[PDB]
Structures are given as C-alpha cells and as structure tokens.
Design a protein around this ligand. Structure first.
Ligand SMILES: NC1=N[C@@]2(CO1)c1cc(-c3cccnc3F)ccc1Oc1c2cc(C2=CCCOC2)nc1F
Ligand SMILES: *[C@@H]1O[C@H](CO)[C@@H](O[C@@H]2O[C@H](CO)[C@@H](O)[C@H](O)[C@H]2NC(C)=O)[C@H](O)[C@H]1NC(C)=O
Ligand SMILES: *[C@@H]1O[C@H](CO)[C@@H](O)[C@H](O)[C@H]1NC(C)=O
Length: 337
C-alpha cells in the first residue's frame, strides 16, 4: 500500500522523480520539495521567444479527458527568481505508471519563467510537500489531497537520498511509510515548531570543539529542495574559516582535498539527540577534481528567517521521515556501502 518513487541524482545537487498529469498521463520530472507547497509544471501555452519555453516537458490540457479549467492566474516569488501562470485541475499519477491516482488536484500551468535558474534544472517542475500555510493561492497540496482521498495507510512520507553520485538508485521517496532498507538503527523524532515549513528547533551547532554556532538555540527547516546546508552569513563565514575553506570565483568555498580528512566533526544538536557529519560527508567532490564545502551562507530575513536549512547534504546522510499525523520529523543514519 505504501508507494515507492525512484529518484534520480544529478551531481548530489538535484533529486527528482517522475510523476504523471492527465489521462493518459503526461510524464513530468519534479523535485519533491518539502520547502514549498505547490505543484507546477511548464505549459505549452508559453511564448516562442522565451528560452524557458524550450527546456522542459510541457502540460497540454487538450490531451487530457480529466482536465477541468480553473484559470486563476498565479505568481510565485522566491530567492533565485520567480515564475507565473494560471491554475488547472487534473489527475496526478505517482509514479507516471503500485502507483496511485490523485483525483481533482489543482496545480499550476507555468507560462512565464524568467531568470537563468530553470535552465540549470534537470527537472521540469516542483511538487511541494510542506504545510498548506505556505501554499500560494491557498491551493490544497498534493500530499494533503491524497490523504483526504485516503490513498495510503499512514499520514507520513520519507526520503532516502543517495549521496554517492554514481550509485543507484539516486534516492527514493516513500509515500505512506518508511523504508528500513535505507537506514540503520531506530528513528528519533523532533516536534515541528512552526507548521509552515518543516521547521524544527535546534539547540546549538558545534564545528569541532572551538566554534559553536546557533548559540543559545535557533530554528531550522528540513528542506529537500535545497542542495546544501544553509545558515546565517556571518555564522557560516566563521565555519568556513574554521575549516580553512576559501571562496572561489563563482562564490563556492573550496578546500584542498588533502586537508579533508583532518577537518573537524560538525555536530547538529537538536531535540536531545546529536547528529554528526564527518568531513567526508559535508564536503562535495566536483569535477579537474575539486573539493567544495557543503555549507552556504544566506541571510533569510524575517518573518520566515533567520533559519538554518538542513538540505540534501544532511538528508542524504540521515534518512528523514516527514510525519503529518503527529507533526514531527524523524532521523536515522542512512544505509551506505
Ligand atoms: N526549498 C526550495 N524550493 C525552491 C527554493 O527553495 C526551489 C528549489 C529548487 C531547487 C534547485 C536546485 C535543486 N533542488 C531544488 F529543489 C528549484 C526551484 C525552486 O523554486 C521555488 C522554491 C520555493 C518556492 C516557494 C514559493 C512560495 C513558498 O515559499 C517557497 N518557489 C519556487 F519557485
Ligand atoms: C479552483 O477554482 C475554484 C472556482 O473557480 C476556486 O474557488 C474555490 O472553489 C471552492 C469550491 O468548493 C470553494 O470552496 C472556494 O470558493 C474555493 N476554494 C478554495 C480552497 O479557495 C479555487 O480557488 C481554485 N483553486 C483551488 C485550489 O480550489
Ligand atoms: C512532541 O509533542 C507531543 C505532543 O503531545 C508530545 O507528546 C511529545 O512528548 C513531544 N516530544 C518532545 C521531545 O517534546
């Protein structure tokens, strides 16, 4: 009864699986993003002269018998850029072909995607798996709608993200259960503080034994739609100096690959349990073979911030369970090889 969704892994930075929209299903690749709450894919009704209109697969409402028109225009903004379009209603299949059919799901037909962001993305769109409180246009999210249709037993979903770039599979989303093959030991849970993002209280962050960040407590979100670990700019700048990383030309922080195994252990201490990240795990190897820091400084302003983002680096190292029945997040050491 729980549904397994294969995930592809692009350079440890993007994790996306296949879904279907319409009857017959039109296949789209989406990032299952716990940092938003809307489902949107590109539309055929984009414009010939926009470059985003030539990149990803497009929703064609003519070819769907289950399509019904909503038409309400939407406009979505965030850090990297923005997109806009109008809403539609159709059946959503997970996966595109064991699977389930979510009926009467309102989503977004993106007709304009300015910026250079979406050109870099190997995925067509986004399926938000956050709370309804951050859903633009107050659109009932996919997971909320599927639980209303009682399509899985448990009001939970779980993420395995393989941080081995060449390994297979790239990851696995588990709708309605948890996959014990992909984690050792037992799960330990944190209560969600703010039901908007998957927000969590963090007691402190220890970079070795000489630098303590998030001093006196701070707030964090568990976000599968963010590649790296993100914290306040000033705090992460201390972290990069403590590990000796220097900013490159593009902004990435680099550290010589010889010095990796001599770098301190970084412990995220939240909710009575401690979560270790050894230097081999919070430092990425990119191609030349150059080693980059897994941390990124970004000031998220109020009311949402300041926030730490436990992105794919953290989730790829700890199997994560998102639980809407008891509003809590679970962690367990992910199985490797
Ligand atoms: N968690 C998170 N999702 C992102 C940004 O941060 C987002 C992430 C990505 C992204 C990029 C690279 C790898 N993985 C990703 F998920 C791409 C597009 C994108 O685009 C959006 C995102 C979030 C949002 C939200 C809109 C309204 C609610 O607040 C966030 N909107 C987007 F268009
Ligand atoms: C989809 O279109 C409808 C009507 O064009 C929009 O209005 C919703 O309609 C429902 C029908 O029962 C009413 O409860 C409300 O007037 C609206 N619902 C909500 C949740 O706002 C609607 O906004 C559009 N989008 C969605 C996601 O329903
Ligand atoms: C989390 O919240 C639930 C709500 O009742 C409570 O039962 C549980 O003890 C809480 N856990 C912690 C660690 O505070």
């Amino acid at each position: 009864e729980p549904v397994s969704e294969l995930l592809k892994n692009y350079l440890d930075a993007q994790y996306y699986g296949e879904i279907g929209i319409g009857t017959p299903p039109q296949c789209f690749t989406v990032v299952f993003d716990t940092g938003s709450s809307n489902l949107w894919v590109p539309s055929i009704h984009c414009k010939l002269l926009d470059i985003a209109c030539w990149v990803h697969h497009k929703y064609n409402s003519d070819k769907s018998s289950t399509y019904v028109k909503n038409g309400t225009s939407f406009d979505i903004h965030y850090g990297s850029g923005s997109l806009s379009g109008y809403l539609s209603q159709d059946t959503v299949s997970v996966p595109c072909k064991g699977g389930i059919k979510v009926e009467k799901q309102i989503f977004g037909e993106a007709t304009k995607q300015p910026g250079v962001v979406f050109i870099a993305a190997k995925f067509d769109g986004i399926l938000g798996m956050g709370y309804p409180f951050i859903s633009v246009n107050n659109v009932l999210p996919v997971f909320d709608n599927l639980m209303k249709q009682k399509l899985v037993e448990k009001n939970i979903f779980s993420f395995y993200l393989n941080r081995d770039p060449t390994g297979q599979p790239g990851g696995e989303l588990m709708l309605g259960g948890t996959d014990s093959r992909y984690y050792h030991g037992e799960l330990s849970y944190l209560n969600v503080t703010r039901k908007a993002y998957w927000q969590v209280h963090m007691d402190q962050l220890e970079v070795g034994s000489e630098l303590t960040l998030c001093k006196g407590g701070c707030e964090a979100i568990v976000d599968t739609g963010t590649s790296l670990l993100v914290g306040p700019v000033d705090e992460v700048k201390e972290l990069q100096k403590a590990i000796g990383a220097v900013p490159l030309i593009q902004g990435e922080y680099m550290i010589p690959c010889e010095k990796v195994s001599s770098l301190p252990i970084i412990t995220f201490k939240l909710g009575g349990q401690n979560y270790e990240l050894h230097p081999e795990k919070y430092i990425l190897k990119v191609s030349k073979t150059i080693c980059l820091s897994g941390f990124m400084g970004m000031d998220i302003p109020p009311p949402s911030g300041p926030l730490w983002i436990l992105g794919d680096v953290f989730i790829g190292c700890y199997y994560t369970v998102f639980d809407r029945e008891y509003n809590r997040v679970g962690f367990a050491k992910a199985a490797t090889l």
